[PDB]
């Protein structure tokens, strides 16, 4: 869209279109947390790391998806290489969660929530893992559905990774605390 001519309403139309498409996924993450409230009430430090866990999940997403798309749009990876990039993105997801969680557990300890150390340590690895895999098989699934991945991957992997970052962090919290 050409910018300097458009008025506030002209901008607002397109911008609210996309932002209201994303506020629905915001709604579903809110509903997931409301469902898991039973552990947030038990310990209130859990909420202290939802932003960092989501900004690592839906970031490993928008990074692996970009990496796969820019290598799938130069014919470096054919679309039939999902099972060969799978056993590579799983490995890099492990080798990257084991350091992102290594830094975040240091942060949690410096905060002083020893009951949070195990849950954060397991959860950041299990979010980076199942966000890297879902950010790497999002472009293949999109291009196999018939849609250009670079178009509708940037928001889609962010939503599909923050939902499944909450749904993993809170589940690990319920398994490790109550």
């Amino acid at each position: 869209l050409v910018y300097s001519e458009a008025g506030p309403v002209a901008l607002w139309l397109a911008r609210v279109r996309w932002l209201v498409i994303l506020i629905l996924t915001g709604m579903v993450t809110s509903s997931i947390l409301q469902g898991f409230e039973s552990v947030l009430e038990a310990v209130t430090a859990l909420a202290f790391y939802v932003p960092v866990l989501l900004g690592t999940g839906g970031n490993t997403g928008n990074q692996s998806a970009t990496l796969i798309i820019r290598a799938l749009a130069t014919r470096d990876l054919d679309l039939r290489d999902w099972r060969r990039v799978f056993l590579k993105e799983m490995g890099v997801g492990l080798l990257l969660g084991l350091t992102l969680s290594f830094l975040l557990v240091g942060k949690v300890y410096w905060d002083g929530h020893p009951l949070l150390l195990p849950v954060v340590g397991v959860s950041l690895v299990l979010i980076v893992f199942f966000a890297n895999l879902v950010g790497a098989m999002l472009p293949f699934l999109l291009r196999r559905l018939g849609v250009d991945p670079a178009l509708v991957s940037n928001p889609l992997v962010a939503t599909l990774s923050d939902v499944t970052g909450l749904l993993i962090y809170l589940s690990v919290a319920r398994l490790l605390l109550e």
Partner: antibody, heavy 124, light 113 residues
């Protein structure tokens, strides 16, 4: 079914640069990758490029990297091969063949439908 | 890449018999995805090679049931039930796993006069 029609007979001088045209018809040219394959003077084939129309980029045979350049035009629905510095060994017939879906909703993955042949002859 | 090949190069058969075309790869053409890309093309004399057998088990559309493609691993084979007069030509067995997707040497289909 699908008719894949390309340019006619071709004649060139050694060291020239010929641009073989392959127009698509009967299918959405944006969503199927065109494969360029050359047949020598009564011999086996040799796959010499796979142009992806939607992205406009291509993957190339090792023996033909540089000796060939694939470009397309989505609106024109034509697949273009541009031979470069074509020596006497390039005196062959050059097929274009639609051969891989963009959605990969085809199963197989090589050579759905082929052109008709653009005899490329190098000589004085 | 895979310096693929066919045997024999000439196949003297009759009209109404069974003809078996071997196709022996150089290295195994099983993909990381994992299915046997050993496509078979028939190039009728003075035409363009149209696809006959894909993913050696399967068959293409518009293809009469006379053609039978089987085998797996590195050794693949296309067999005819009854050689008809519309099936003569040269038979290319290609691959699609390892770039470049090389083609076979191709074998003709003569008549055993």
């Amino acid at each position: 079914e699908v008719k894949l029609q390309e340019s006619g007979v071709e004649l060139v001088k050694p060291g020239a640069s010929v641009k073989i045209s392959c127009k698509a018809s009967g299918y959405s040219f944006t969503g199927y990758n065109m494969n360029w394959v050359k047949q020598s003077h009564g011999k086996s084939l040799e796959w010499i490029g796979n142009i992806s129309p939607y992205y406009g980029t291509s993957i190339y045979n090792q023996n033909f990297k540089g000796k060939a350049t694939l470009t397309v035009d989505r609106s024109s629905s034509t697949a273009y091969m541009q031979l470069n510095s074509l020596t006497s060994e390039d005196s062959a017939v050059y097929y274009c063949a639609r051969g891989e879906s963009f959605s990969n909703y085809e199963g197989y993955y090589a050579m759905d439908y082929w052109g008709q042949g653009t005899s490329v002859i190098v000589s004085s | 890449d895979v310096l693929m090949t066919q045997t024999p190069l000439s196949l003297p058969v009759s009209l109404g018999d069974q003809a078996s075309i071997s196709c022996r790869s150089s290295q195994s053409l099983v993909h990381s995805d994992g299915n046997t890309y050993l496509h078979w093309y028939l190039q009728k004399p003075g035409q363009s090679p149209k696809l006959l057998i894909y993913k050696v088990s399967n068959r293409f559309s518009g293809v009469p049931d006379r053609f039978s493609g089987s085998g797996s691993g590195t050794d693949f084979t296309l067999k005819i039930s009854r050689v008809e007069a519309e099936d003569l030509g040269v038979y290319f067995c290609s691959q699609s796993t390892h770039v470049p997707w090389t083609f076979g040497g191709g074998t003709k289909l003569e008549i055993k006069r």
